[model samples]
Target: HMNFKMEHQNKRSPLHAAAEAGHVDICHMLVQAGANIDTCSEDQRTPLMEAAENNHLEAVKYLIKAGALVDPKDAEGSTCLHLAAKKGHYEVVQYLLSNGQMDVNCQDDGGWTPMIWATEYKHVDLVKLLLSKGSDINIRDNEENICLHWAAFSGCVDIAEILLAAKCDLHAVNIHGDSPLHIAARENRYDCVVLFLSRDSDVTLKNKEGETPLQCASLNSQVWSALQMSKALQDS
Candidate 1:
């Protein structure tokens, strides 16, 4: 029986090595030598994925330009595009969208878009990049959590700020009927809660438990007071 480690460790093609090692010129020569561009490694990572994930811009751009399809999935149902965006490879992602025509809204194994991956990891510039490329800021995951919901839940104030400027749905709720505000309040993310409240998000919006975001702020009196203050100011 072939050891799995040996399969992975030894099975990488020359193109894979060239891509990962930032040797774009070598990769181009190998591609001309009949090397397969989309051949999967033992773990299913494509040569493009290797290049993109390693932040090798020239290798990635070359692979994509040479007709390497971006639709292949990796071990986690991740595409080369997702890996590129996740790793903050701004130029790689830009080229993927513009040159390769990669679907910006493409979802991964768990229904996570490249936007979601970028947002969840707090790559502020990456998030902005995806948004500029027409990423659906309001796109939902399997759990119905939009990008704003993730920003709120993760306490990513800058991401939230960017999403807000993009005109994302502040009232977007998850499967639990909790808006982004409710998520921030419940997760004790003070900055997000304050941002949402200041944006005139409905504090009285109910969740599945009939609890408003104001009610979800049980831990922090500071957050609770901010919510109340906003509610009062809006009413007056």
Candidate 2:
């Protein structure tokens, strides 16, 4: 039998195949046969990277125990934890945090944290785990978008509640000067708009284009009127 280290068309080693397909038995055999567990593919993806994103927890565990590098960033600066976070792989993320000892607050080249990815992907459970781990709640990406902004943009009132409870900086804006309220308005996220108002998100704050939250949702009659109503209350 050949030693299982050869690559196929996309540069997937035998170990990468087993890991990606969740075949831990094959993974163990490949590793025992000297397959490179940390081999990088065309995009610098290793076996653990695939396993984590694909939710193959056992494969990830075996690879980590085999001494695979846990926090290796791929070409886009995404670590295995980031991949799991992006795909909302709960167990894989938890395993990486403990067994792999991954840093919870690490950001990629684009400055995206696991908390931000989990928020953007609507993983409330993961968000709670990350929050308890003390993820920098106010960290921003290259576009200066924090987790609250992502939650608002996605209309996730649950995640918004989670961030608000954690004292997220609601007053912060993106590079375009668009606040969470503005994003909720622009995206027609009515529930998020109501939540932001309850949290005292400023309606008067304007974006780089100088559009207020009311103006962003001008065509959305319900949102427009709701913002207008909040404005009226402030005038009193």
Candidate 3:
């Protein structure tokens, strides 16, 4: 039998390492040698989770076929899809969706679905695919923040455009009292600030503390650019 020991600060088993490296042949060999397919690391990351996280579609397929549970939550309560989506693995996303074995809307430890993670990274193709696969465009995180808010916060102009086209609610506010406009200004993303302003976002809109988008921008060095964008918004 092959030796198995803890790694990742003594968190992972040997199978976890094999899965993470996308060693499909080695993985098969280990399983045949009596390695546990579902054995999780100290963080509860199974072989399937590692395969999905690394975008190892073939390895993932093999694991699933070998009876790896689709929705097993790790120590953080994140499934394979959550990790895959966060990494923007569109092929893996497609495979998981088509398999119909996992819930597309399953929330992670942060109460965010895979779609939210994809949008946060501004993965256009992944976002589009998730939307098509019935992922809730409006799914909120534990903070009650939606993907549109994430796009703005990340200054993802392209993703913002796509979400807006999908009719994402621009007016939604998170628990921190920050709206999309407020987030855009805080990030000092000139193009995104311009984009949101052009959409007639409430420039004077304040958060829970009575701070406006401009106020948030002032806290960052991008205040000048944000102010200029506001001017352009006013003119246009």
Candidate 4:
């Protein structure tokens, strides 16, 4: 007999609060009381997004079973899958993927995919999982930056290695014409720069601003040393 549609200050319903809190029992009770599974809050976030963002695996499973729409995007154009991947909720991600209702390649308002978010957040396992799930390693975002670019910018050597091993284009440029190596060097990601160099990333490639990886490494002595060594080896 509870009012399932009641809203709080954020206009989030009881289901939203329960899902965010990972309270599966409360979610079930609300669903049974005829809560609108697709009801959205002020920001258009559904209960599914709440559960996925909060890493509430059980709540997510329950919501899905109760016919919650898995692919609904919030106001930010982020789906539950995006939220789960962004938060590194492996089990929730697994369930969502297995459910087959979520698009692994779904992009947000900023044109960022789950893979990009996972790489940007340095969630190596999540990135590996997405890749194993057949995520497009070369898919570009709004900025034309692929997951490798984010990986390099975040300084995740392992992630960069994984993407490279997947045959991601080493010389692929962003909208700024900067390659992953350029991003690594510009960000002073020394280990990433080393990995990119070891993988034969073109140090000579220039960005739209005419900056090469060498030029980008001007601020980091260690990265500069590595790039200098690689450039010397390449020339020799």
Ranking by TM-score: 4, 2, 1, 3
**Tens-place lDDT digits, model 1, residues 23-119:** 9899988888777777778788889999989999888878887988788888888998999888878888888888888889988888889989988
Candidate 4, run of 10 with poorest lDDT: 1-10
Model 2, residue 72: distance off in Å is: 1.6
Off by over 4 Å in 2: 1-10
lDDT digits (tens) for residues 56-161 of candidate 4: 8888888898899877887889998888888898999999998746788889999899999888888889999999997988788998998888898899899999
Tens digits of lDDT, candidate 3, 18-41: 888888999899888877778767
What candidate 4 gets wrong by more than 4 Å, as runs, is 1-10
- For candidate 3, the per-residue lDDT at 79 reads 88
Task: Quantify all predictions' global Cα lDDT against the true fold.
Answer: 0.85, 0.87, 0.81, 0.86
**Best to worst by lDDT, what's the order?**
2, 4, 1, 3
Best by TM-score: 4
TM-score of 3: 0.85
- Model 2 C-alpha RMSD vs. true structure (Å) is 2.4
